[PDB]
Amino acid sequence: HVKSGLQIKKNAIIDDYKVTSQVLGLGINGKVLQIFNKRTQEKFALKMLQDCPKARREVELHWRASQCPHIVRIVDVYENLYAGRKCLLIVMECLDGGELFSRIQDTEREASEIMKSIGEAIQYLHSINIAHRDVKPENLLYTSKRPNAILKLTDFGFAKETKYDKSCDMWSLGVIMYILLCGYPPFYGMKTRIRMGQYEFPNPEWSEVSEEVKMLIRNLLKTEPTQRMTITEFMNHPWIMQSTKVPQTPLHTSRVLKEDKERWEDVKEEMTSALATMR
Numbered sequence: 001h002v003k004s005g006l007q008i009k010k011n012a013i014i015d016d017y018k019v020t021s022q023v024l025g026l027g028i029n030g031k032v033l034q035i036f037n038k039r040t041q042e043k044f045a046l047k048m049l050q051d052c053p054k055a056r057r058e059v060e061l062h063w064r065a066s067q068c069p070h071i072v073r074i075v076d077v078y079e080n081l082y083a084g085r086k087c088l089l090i091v092m093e094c095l096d097g098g099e100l101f102s103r104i105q106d107t108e109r110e111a112s113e114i115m116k117s118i119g120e121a122i123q124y125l126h127s128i129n130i131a132h133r134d135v136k137p138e139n140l141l142y143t144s145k146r147p148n149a150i151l152k153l154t155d156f157g158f159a160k161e162t163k164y165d166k167s168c169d170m171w172s173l174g175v176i177m178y179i180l181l182c183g184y185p186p187f188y189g190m191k192t193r194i195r196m197g198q199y200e201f202p203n204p205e206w207s208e209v210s211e212e213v214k215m216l217i218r219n220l221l222k223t224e225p226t227q228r229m230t231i232t233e234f235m236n237h238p239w240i241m242q243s244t245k246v247p248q249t250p251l252h253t254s255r256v257l258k259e260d261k262e263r264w265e266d267v268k269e270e271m272t273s274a275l276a277t278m279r
């Protein structure tokens with residue numbers, strides 16, 4: 001029950017990790033990086049922030065959430081002086097496995113087992129009154145390249161300690177589900193179609209998909225936030241709850257995600273701004 005509180009180290013991060021000026025210079029510009037622990041040799045991830053209230057918020061929330069088996073663990077946080085400018089250097093577990101959809105790009109039950117995982121990340125956050133507000137393809141990473149890797153939620157730049165915010169996380173869940181089951185997002189102006197909730201479940205991709213499953217997506221994508229299901233109701237849905245009573249039925253996802261790649265950069269982009277719009 002009792003876990004340690006957050007301790008910001010003030011020694012030069014380069015005492016503890018191999019990091020170079022080149023791999024530091026790319027950091028101040030948002031990118032997260034490959035670093036190595038000197039004592040153990042293990043691989044970790046570095047993310048660099050300029051110290052400021054926003055950065056302190058992120059670190060704080062992320063530390064609080066690290067506990068979850070389904071959220072990237074903060075391992076250390078440093079407060080250093082970089083080129084005469086205060087910085088927060090965040091050290092994280094390394095996620096070799098790449099982004100959720102990049103994997104698939106290589107089964108209904110597999111789709112469900114994934115959503116249950118993203119589901120736990122959200123339940124944990126919501127239990128401790130945090131809303132993530134940027135749950136999307138590139139914040140879902142697999143620990144390693146093994147078939148059995150754990151999928152983890154990352155990036156708390158927009159997380160917010162509290163509901164409208166929470167329902168934003170549920171909407172993402174709907175969108176990630178839709179794509180998982182077919183390989184393309186819903187709402188196929190864009191802004192208008194989202195406002196209007198204008199999506200469908202096209203054959204062929206959706207012909208042998210349970211009405212129960214569609215109803216589920218339908219609840220998550222509700223245009224009126226107070227109408228969406230909550231994480232608890234999501235997590236108690238049969239499709240999610242018993243992820244091993246769900247039919248091994250094949251999905252067009254992997255093929256579609258392969259042919260229709262090149263659009264992938266555009267859907268990552270649309271979803272990022274949809275999210276930006278609901279914040």
Ligand SMILES: C=NC(=O)c1cc2ccc(-c3cc(Nc4ccnc(N)n4)ccc3O)cc2s1
Binds near residue numbers: 092094155
């Ligand atoms: C495939 N070549 C490699 O050898 C790897 C390079 C990287 C680079 C980064 C990460 C990694 C990335 C993130 N990403 C972000 C981005 C933004 N915010 C947050 N909190 N995390 C979070 C945790 C991570 O381990 C894993 C690897 S594996």
